[PDB]
Design a protein around this ligand. Structure first.
Ligand SMILES: O=S1(=O)NCN(C2CC2)c2cc(CCc3ccc4c(c3)N(C3CC3)CNS4(=O)=O)ccc21
Ligand SMILES: N[C@@H](CCC(=O)O)C(=O)O
Ligand SMILES: N[C@@H](CCC(=O)O)C(=O)O
Ligand SMILES: [Cl-]
Ligand SMILES: [Cl-]
Ligand SMILES: [Cl-]
Ligand SMILES: [Cl-]
Ligand SMILES: [Cl-]
Ligand SMILES: [Cl-]
Ligand SMILES: [Cl-]
Lengths: 264, 258
């Protein structure tokens, strides 16, 4: 019954968790900065526990293997007892809800389209009705699962192309997808979550943009293992910080307050 | 055995059908939350009976009595097994009842008569010609009372003591007040209901500015209820299948008079 340090699994994803400039001479949680770094501190204060930030070893959000049927990423860390809690841009999904707990959402997002400025694309329907511009998603994430399991005509049509496109249209990190859009002269569009799309749109060289409306509506939740006694208090902490307006303050802090692409 | 569902008459969520007087049971009602209750019950495999909350209130706790009214009280005191309604997820409610993951997004918004010289909550707080208020016994009123944000705290100080009362008992009452006040009244309501009214005749109201907060509606059950697990998974399933977006388009825009 003695108080133990809470093991927090997170992921290096800008601006949620980022290496500080002088990280090579810093230790522990001091190495990291970002939205989820500030959020982890706010949560820990309200719940009154100590915690250690740990980057997920495999750098994945969470997917279940078809053959082995074992969870990887931050989800696996919680399922197999490697971490006590996940504080990261982890999307709430049906399949994950069955195996882990999710607090009420702390941030909203929907799948969106990233294009290099000037690309003749305005919607997912435009992508599905053409072949000149390739497009893909992140691996081991909820966006890829959205298209694989979608029974909607446009989305089902897009998945049928992406799953067998050559060379692979999928990426293993968001930065990989951003670079692919930037160095493809408009011949590649990246399907990612609106939160990350809006952030990149505010970073140099300011050559990308979110186009069209979102394909779905969901949020990020603070995840814990099923039955964890921490879930109750953290859930109330999220709602408290939301009502106080802190969650709105943190987004502006890490998305627009230091936007490198103008004042607007 | 039959699940008692408490809901509230709020368009387009729950509405009396035409010729409802010769109908009985769940067939008397139509709307977004009526379809949602059917979708949820089908996925969880239970029978249910729709009942309008007796006091016609969403849910607030009396300061002295500490007694919950509205649909929240129905769940706390065992009068209903589940609430399927535009019930806002809030911190104070989370302490006393369970909430599924949200099934619809909303934020506090401003309703004005078209042409009113107002663009933000900050504009309202910095003037006195145009009155403004909220619904009683709801989450919007509680948001302003408990807010330490400068603009919202300033707005609450005015509304709590304005005469005549700027608060209303129903959404329809607030809509009417905006329409026949020649722009000297703005109504603070949730964006979902603001967007619906904006698409209804006489098309003389509009939603202005961004929302003041960001939250959602959740399917509510008593704390510890065994139903909470199945309904929560049902909501997420309907979300990923896209049926929640379908129902939204069905009851908000598919019949637009503006
Ligand atoms: O994956 S979901 O759970 N399932 C389905 N949907 C869709 C609507 C059908 C959504 C939608 C959202 C965004 C709207 C929303 C709802 C509730 C709350 C929000 C923001 N906040 C704000 C900080 C962001 C705080 N607490 S809160 O009051 O709970 C998030 C998660 C999901
Ligand atoms: N937030 C996603 C990862 C990013 C994406 O899939 O676009 C997840 O939890 O899997
Ligand atoms: N959805 C709101 C309605 C009343 C309000 O606008 O605050 C509630 O549950 O209280
Ligand atoms: Cl320890
Ligand atoms: Cl009605
Ligand atoms: Cl009638
Ligand atoms: Cl019936
Ligand atoms: Cl039934
Ligand atoms: Cl709240
Ligand atoms: Cl302030």
């Amino acid at each position: 019954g003695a108080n133990k340090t809470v093991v927090v699994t997170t992921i290096l994803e800008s601006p949620y968790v980022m290496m500080k400039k002088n990280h090579e001479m810093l230790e522990g949680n001091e190495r990291y900065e970002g939205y989820c770094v500030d959020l982890a501190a706010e949560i820990a204060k309200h719940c009154g526990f100590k915690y250690k930030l740990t980057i997920v070893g495999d750098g994945k959000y969470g997917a279940r293997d078809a053959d082995t049927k074992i969870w990887n990423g931050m989800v696996g860390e919680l399922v197999y007892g490697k971490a006590d809690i996940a504080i990261a841009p982890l999307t709430i999904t049906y399949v994950r809800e069955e195996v882990i707990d999710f607090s009420k959402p702390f941030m909203s997002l929907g799948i969106s389209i990233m294009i290099k400025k000037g690309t003749p694309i305005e919607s997912a329907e435009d992508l599905s009705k053409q072949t000149e511009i390739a497009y893909g998603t992140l691996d081991s994430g909820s966006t890829k699962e959205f298209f694989r399991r979608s029974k909607i005509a446009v989305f089902d049509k897009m998945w049928t192309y992406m799953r067998s496109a050559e060379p692979s249209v999928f990426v293993r990190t968001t930065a990989e997808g951003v670079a692919r859009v930037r160095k493809s002269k408009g011949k590649y569009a990246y399907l990612l979550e609106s939160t990350m799309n809006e952030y990149i749109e505010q970073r140099k060289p300011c050559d990308t943009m979110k186009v069209g409306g979102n394909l779905d509506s969901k949020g990020y939740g603070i995840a814990t293992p099923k039955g964890s006694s921490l879930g109750n208090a953290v859930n109330l902490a999220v709602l408290k910080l939301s009502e106080q307006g802190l969650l709105d303050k943190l987004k502006n802090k890490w998305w627009y307050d230091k936007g490198e692409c103008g004042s607007g």
